Amino acid sequence: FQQFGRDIADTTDAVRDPQTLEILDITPCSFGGVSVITPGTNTSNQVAVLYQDVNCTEVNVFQTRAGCLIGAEHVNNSYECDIPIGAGICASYQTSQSIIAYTMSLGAENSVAYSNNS
Amino acid sequence: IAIPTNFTISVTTEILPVSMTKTSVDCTMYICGDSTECSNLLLQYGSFCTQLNRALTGIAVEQDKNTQEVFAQVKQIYKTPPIKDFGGFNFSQILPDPSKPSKRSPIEDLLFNKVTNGLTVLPPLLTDEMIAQYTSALLAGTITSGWTFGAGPALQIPFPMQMAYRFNGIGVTQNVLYENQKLIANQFNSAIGKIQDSLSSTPSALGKLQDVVNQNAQALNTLVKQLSSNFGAISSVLNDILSRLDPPEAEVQIDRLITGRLQSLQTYVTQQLIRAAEIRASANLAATKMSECVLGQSKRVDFCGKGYHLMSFPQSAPHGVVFLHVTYVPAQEKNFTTAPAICHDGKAHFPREGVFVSNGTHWFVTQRNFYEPQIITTDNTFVSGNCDVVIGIVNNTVYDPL
Amino acid sequence: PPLLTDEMIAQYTSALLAGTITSGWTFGAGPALQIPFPMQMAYRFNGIGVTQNVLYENQKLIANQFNSAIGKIQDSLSSTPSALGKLQDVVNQNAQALNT
Amino acid sequence: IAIPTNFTISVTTEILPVSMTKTSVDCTMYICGDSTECSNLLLQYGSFCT
Amino acid sequence: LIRAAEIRASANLAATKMSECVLGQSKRVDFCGKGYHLMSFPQSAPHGVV
Ligand SMILES: *[C@@H]1O[C@H](CO)[C@@H](O[C@@H]2O[C@H](CO)[C@@H](O)[C@H](O)[C@H]2NC(C)=O)[C@H](O)[C@H]1NC(C)=O
Ligand SMILES: *[C@@H]1O[C@H](CO)[C@@H](O[C@@H]2O[C@H](CO)[C@@H](O)[C@H](O)[C@H]2NC(C)=O)[C@H](O)[C@H]1NC(C)=O
Ligand SMILES: *[C@@H]1O[C@H](CO)[C@@H](O[C@@H]2O[C@H](CO)[C@@H](O)[C@H](O)[C@H]2NC(C)=O)[C@H](O)[C@H]1NC(C)=O
Ligand SMILES: *[C@@H]1O[C@H](CO)[C@@H](O)[C@H](O)[C@H]1NC(C)=O
Ligand SMILES: *[C@@H]1O[C@H](CO)[C@@H](O)[C@H](O)[C@H]1NC(C)=O
Ligand SMILES: *[C@@H]1O[C@H](CO)[C@@H](O)[C@H](O)[C@H]1NC(C)=O
Ligand SMILES: *[C@@H]1O[C@H](CO)[C@@H](O)[C@H](O)[C@H]1NC(C)=O
Ligand SMILES: *[C@@H]1O[C@H](CO)[C@@H](O)[C@H](O)[C@H]1NC(C)=O
Ligand SMILES: *[C@@H]1O[C@H](CO)[C@@H](O)[C@H](O)[C@H]1NC(C)=O
């Protein structure tokens, strides 16, 4: 005898079709903020757009945990963070010149020589 | 006078919150969800939504800065040697575990397991793997260099010699360590094991870290629950209000709803600001603790646990940090009869470093924090004055080593 | 009403005073260990770069100065022009807020 | 160079606040004092009280 | 709330001062009065310490 479901926070998230009794699930269609990643206008005039928390179907397209990044070329290297984005991903204007998104490097690798006599 | 004759090594624990959860709220979408009339009416209020968005962005940036300044204390990344001949000490319970994925220590795994509509959350800039790498680098640098890597370039040093330095730093001769290495190592290992066992057994181990999350969740829940109030209007649902009432009269109801929701948003933002300020204060305290207690040895009392401070090690935790302070504490003491000075030939002898003592028949001089009698000679005392000014001076004989 | 009463606060302060006087700083780190007060003061001088000869030869002068300073502090605390402003401003502010 | 030849022992005071007066204000009694109609009207605002 | 935050900060400072200055001897300058520190004693007061 139940018609429509509800959530813990009192949000409609399940409806049964009247004509054909069958359970359906309701999820709102995607939304999110928009951010623009740019260097100084003195340096250049090229920009990149980060679509926050939206899946790369509703819009050089790159996928991150923060969102869908457009206009940045992925690389294999690792540099110091310049313009933070999220989840350890940073972007900078580097050489020709373009915008690259990478994984930030914590520091230089080291290993001190240890022994019980030195 | 009472002098200890034995010591125990103890390890304690400290938990400090560092960062909050980054959140953002769309003012327009929250107040009016896809309603042209509501948006137009709200347009006649000003820059409240902009102010709220700016405040929330500032909060998020502050959280990221807090975590960065707390954990990014080292310039390079060090690695422990493959050999594990640390003079008999056992560090397997705090070093990263290679067998299990994610490269976290068993204590860190126990810590992680214990804590388990216009609203968006942003991911933190630094991930758990990077935090773990920082903690491992700090731990290895400490273990293999003492405080030299924090002072300047890293310099290696055997661990028993470093512990001898640390004992010398609290007024106890390194003699004691070089005699009781085995006992001290056994006590250290047993204390580490006890901390590992007790942390899981005690239920209220991470009360602060749980409380922060609970408060944030409750605030978000009450903010989202406030959306279902009439605020004196005919109904609390905008589409039904529009479908029922006429355009001339629906304006009042929409205005009442807008007023209520704007007030709710303002209250939520103010509460967030206050809580963020408190969290920032806690993060500053944690950063000071890390700097002054892990990268060095501090003489401040009760700043790094109860007792005389020796060393400490950091461990990461969800939205916080955990310290393991290692301290020295006297255990077993007797009492004797003391004297301020000694008369030899009309001259007064005072101890150089130590205190005079006797068991009832002979007089000796020892240290201050450990019973270790020595015979009285001219290398333990210095002459100053005569035998007529000091109150309570005692006849005796001072041996001549010549 | 507050959880801790004034008598309990006084008991804590008396315990701290007695522990300090009769043990130096040992009771804050481990078990309490007795020590004569002149010897403790000699240690305190030794901690600031002054040898123990100074105290062991000027004990009487130092004691007289200590007692005189304590008396002066008591007299100033009585005949001062409202030095306890920090503890009064809070009460004034709370009263004003409640009155408004 | 100057080297002291005598000393003095000085005692100073320092005052610090610790706690303020605990207080609690009855939300409903303060707003709608013993009034069923006022309480019913207020009940439409939500969780501005708890 | 805003006033209580400040009161809590002052209470934390007082606790740190007590722990570092009554139970031991401190080498921090001007933390425990002008001059070279020797010792200190606490005294209770209404909603504060001295
Ligand atoms: C000082 O204390 C240690 C314990 O911290 C004593 O070591 C214990 O000695 C007893 C008797 O020899 C053994 O049964 C225990 O197993 C020892 N404990 C450990 C951890 O090894 C030590 O004997 C004490 N020394 C003196 C002189 O009293
Ligand atoms: C350091 O401690 C760990 C345990 O905390 C020791 O590992 C144990 O070794 C014994 C003997 O091989 C095994 O029976 C246990 O199952 C091991 N425990 C774990 C958790 O692996 C380790 O041996 C110690 N280090 C040294 C050098 O002995
Ligand atoms: C106080 O210490 C002295 C020094 O050890 C003790 O004198 C020794 O006593 C033992 C007997 O227990 C003798 O075998 C030694 O020859 C003594 N040493 C010297 C240099 O004479 C003295 O006995 C201790 N006092 C007490 C009450 O035990
Ligand atoms: C409504 O009519 C259709 C047409 O046959 C039928 O399949 C459906 O089951 C009917 N609805 C209900 C609730 O019986
Ligand atoms: C994100 O997009 C990819 C690509 O189509 C898809 O496989 C994945 O299921 C999407 N995730 C979500 C949560 O929609
Ligand atoms: C590394 O480079 C290869 C090709 O050069 C590419 O396929 C791969 O995705 C890169 N990986 C990363 C992590 O950049
Ligand atoms: C102090 O000395 C007395 C007598 O010399 C003795 O009875 C007492 O047990 C001693 N105190 C301790 C803690 O051993
Ligand atoms: C210790 O005090 C007692 C009693 O006041 C006194 O008889 C004794 O002489 C004092 N000790 C010294 C070394 O003066
Ligand atoms: C210490 O020795 C001197 C040397 O003559 C003597 O006069 C004095 O009485 C002695 N002290 C005691 C307490 O007997």
CSV table of C-alpha atoms in Angstrom, one decimal, chain B residues 254-383:
chain,number,residue,atom,x,y,z
B,254,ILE,CA,7.7,34.5,-1.5
B,255,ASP,CA,9.2,37.4,0.4
B,256,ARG,CA,8.5,35.7,3.8
B,257,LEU,CA,10.1,32.5,2.5
B,258,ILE,CA,13.1,34.4,1.2
B,259,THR,CA,13.6,36.2,4.5
B,260,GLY,CA,13.5,33.0,6.5
B,261,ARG,CA,15.9,31.1,4.3
B,262,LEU,CA,18.3,34.1,4.2
B,263,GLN,CA,18.3,34.3,8.0
B,264,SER,CA,19.0,30.6,8.2
B,265,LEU,CA,22.0,30.9,5.8
B,266,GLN,CA,23.4,33.8,7.7
B,267,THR,CA,23.2,31.9,11.0
B,268,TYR,CA,24.9,28.8,9.5
B,269,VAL,CA,27.7,30.9,8.0
B,270,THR,CA,28.4,32.7,11.3
B,271,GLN,CA,28.6,29.4,13.2
B,272,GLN,CA,31.0,28.0,10.5
B,273,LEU,CA,33.2,31.1,10.9
B,274,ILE,CA,33.5,30.6,14.7
B,275,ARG,CA,34.2,26.9,14.5
B,276,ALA,CA,36.8,27.5,11.8
B,277,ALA,CA,38.6,30.0,14.0
B,278,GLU,CA,38.7,27.5,16.9
B,279,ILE,CA,40.0,24.8,14.5
B,280,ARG,CA,42.7,27.2,13.3
B,281,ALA,CA,43.8,27.8,16.8
B,282,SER,CA,44.1,24.1,17.4
B,283,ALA,CA,46.0,23.6,14.2
B,284,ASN,CA,48.5,26.3,15.2
B,285,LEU,CA,49.0,24.6,18.6
B,286,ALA,CA,49.6,21.2,16.8
B,287,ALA,CA,52.1,22.7,14.5
B,288,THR,CA,54.0,24.3,17.4
B,289,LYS,CA,54.0,20.9,19.2
B,290,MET,CA,55.3,19.1,16.1
B,291,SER,CA,58.1,21.6,15.5
B,292,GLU,CA,59.3,21.9,19.1
B,293,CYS,CA,58.8,18.3,20.1
B,294,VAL,CA,59.6,16.0,17.2
B,295,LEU,CA,62.4,17.9,15.6
B,296,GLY,CA,64.1,18.5,18.9
B,297,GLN,CA,64.1,18.0,22.7
B,298,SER,CA,62.3,20.5,24.9
B,299,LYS,CA,62.9,21.4,28.5
B,300,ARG,CA,59.4,22.9,29.0
B,301,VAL,CA,57.4,21.1,31.7
B,302,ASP,CA,54.3,19.1,30.7
B,303,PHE,CA,54.5,20.4,27.1
B,304,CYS,CA,55.5,16.9,25.8
B,305,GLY,CA,53.8,14.6,28.2
B,306,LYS,CA,54.4,13.9,31.9
B,307,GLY,CA,58.0,13.4,33.0
B,308,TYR,CA,61.3,14.4,31.5
B,309,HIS,CA,61.0,14.5,27.7
B,310,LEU,CA,63.2,12.2,25.6
B,311,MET,CA,61.6,12.0,22.1
B,312,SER,CA,58.3,11.6,20.3
B,313,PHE,CA,57.0,10.2,17.0
B,314,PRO,CA,54.2,11.5,14.8
B,315,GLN,CA,51.3,9.5,13.4
B,316,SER,CA,48.6,10.6,11.0
B,317,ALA,CA,44.8,10.3,11.6
B,318,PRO,CA,41.6,11.4,9.9
B,319,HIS,CA,41.5,15.2,10.1
B,320,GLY,CA,44.1,15.2,12.9
B,321,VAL,CA,47.5,14.1,14.2
B,322,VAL,CA,48.6,11.8,17.0
B,323,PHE,CA,51.9,12.0,19.0
B,324,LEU,CA,53.6,9.3,21.0
B,325,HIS,CA,55.7,11.1,23.7
B,326,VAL,CA,58.5,9.1,25.3
B,327,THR,CA,59.4,10.3,28.8
B,328,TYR,CA,61.7,9.4,31.7
B,329,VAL,CA,60.4,9.1,35.2
B,330,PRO,CA,62.1,8.1,38.5
B,331,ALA,CA,60.7,4.9,40.1
B,332,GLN,CA,62.4,3.6,43.3
B,333,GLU,CA,63.9,5.8,46.0
B,334,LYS,CA,65.4,5.7,49.5
B,335,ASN,CA,66.3,8.6,51.8
B,336,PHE,CA,69.5,9.7,53.5
B,337,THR,CA,71.1,12.4,55.6
B,338,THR,CA,72.6,15.4,53.6
B,339,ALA,CA,74.9,18.3,54.4
B,340,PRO,CA,75.5,21.6,52.5
B,341,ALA,CA,79.3,21.7,52.8
B,342,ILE,CA,82.3,19.9,54.3
B,343,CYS,CA,85.2,21.1,56.5
B,344,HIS,CA,88.7,19.7,55.7
B,345,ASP,CA,91.4,22.0,57.1
B,346,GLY,CA,89.3,25.1,57.9
B,347,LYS,CA,88.2,25.3,54.3
B,348,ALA,CA,84.7,24.7,52.9
B,349,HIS,CA,84.2,22.3,50.0
B,350,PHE,CA,81.1,22.5,47.9
B,351,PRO,CA,79.9,19.9,45.3
B,352,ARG,CA,80.8,20.6,41.7
B,353,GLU,CA,77.8,18.8,40.2
B,354,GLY,CA,75.9,16.7,42.7
B,355,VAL,CA,74.8,16.6,46.3
B,356,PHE,CA,76.6,15.3,49.4
B,357,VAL,CA,75.0,12.2,51.0
B,358,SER,CA,75.7,9.5,53.7
B,359,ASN,CA,74.2,6.3,54.8
B,360,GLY,CA,75.2,6.8,58.4
B,361,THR,CA,78.9,5.9,58.5
B,362,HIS,CA,80.6,7.4,55.4
B,363,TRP,CA,80.0,10.5,53.2
B,364,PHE,CA,79.8,10.4,49.4
B,365,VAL,CA,78.7,12.5,46.5
B,366,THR,CA,76.3,11.3,43.8
B,367,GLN,CA,74.3,12.8,40.9
B,368,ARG,CA,70.9,14.4,41.4
B,369,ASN,CA,68.6,11.9,39.5
B,370,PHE,CA,70.2,8.6,40.2
B,371,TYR,CA,71.9,7.0,43.2
B,372,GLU,CA,75.6,6.4,42.4
B,373,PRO,CA,78.0,7.0,45.3
B,374,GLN,CA,81.5,8.3,44.7
B,375,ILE,CA,84.4,8.8,47.0
B,376,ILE,CA,85.0,12.5,48.0
B,377,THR,CA,88.2,13.9,46.3
B,378,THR,CA,89.4,17.3,45.0
B,379,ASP,CA,88.0,16.6,41.6
B,380,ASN,CA,84.4,16.6,42.9
B,381,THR,CA,84.5,19.7,45.1
B,382,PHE,CA,85.8,23.3,44.9
B,383,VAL,CA,87.0,25.4,47.8
